[PDB]
Amino acid sequence: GAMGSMERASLIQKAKLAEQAERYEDMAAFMKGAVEKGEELSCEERNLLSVAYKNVVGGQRAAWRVLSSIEQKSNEEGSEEKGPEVREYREKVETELQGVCDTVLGLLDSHLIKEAGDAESRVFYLKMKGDYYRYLAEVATGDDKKRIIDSARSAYQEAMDISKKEMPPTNPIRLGLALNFSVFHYEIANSPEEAISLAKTTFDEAMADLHTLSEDSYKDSTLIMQLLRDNLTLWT
């Protein structure tokens, strides 16, 4: 732990500064250091952790997709052999991506999930676990691809079961979990009908609970509801 000598509160402060500076690798390192202090994370702190790693892995995923596309074209019928370089560099980015995912999954397993008892924390972390296994699945091709997919599915499913029992249908964590699990079905599990059903049912159950919300809560919930609709429009 290179952050072992820094105060927890200083790490959180610097994560916020790194966010303002769009230095997301630094932000992720600061928030990894904060997690490794061993204390549970508050709501704000959980979201700093997720924002940081989502931005880091999001950049890696975008790069991997560019390189994968170049690699597949170099493998089409009629292409001039360019040598091993495209594959090598795609593999380099892939390995770095897998490393970030393993780091996040490691933080969740040591020991964020096991200490998370409230629905808002436990569902949040299990959603993250599903998300980072999903990112591993996006690049997986070996003896373990089915097991990676099942690890994502299992984490999402536990998160879903808790969220349906313990949170209202408009809860933004519950909505975001369903959004992402629906994308898992469509893009990873080759289950577009499940993806569409889940998005539609989530949207409709949220619609019916909006009347209970304040103006600010309404804005939060309807934002994610619009993403569900966006995906449904993409898929139908």
Binding site: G176, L179, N180, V183, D230, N231
Partner: peptide, 5 residues
């Protein structure tokens, strides 16, 4: 790509 959060 579809939306995720």
């Amino acid at each position: 790509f579809p939306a995720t959060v």
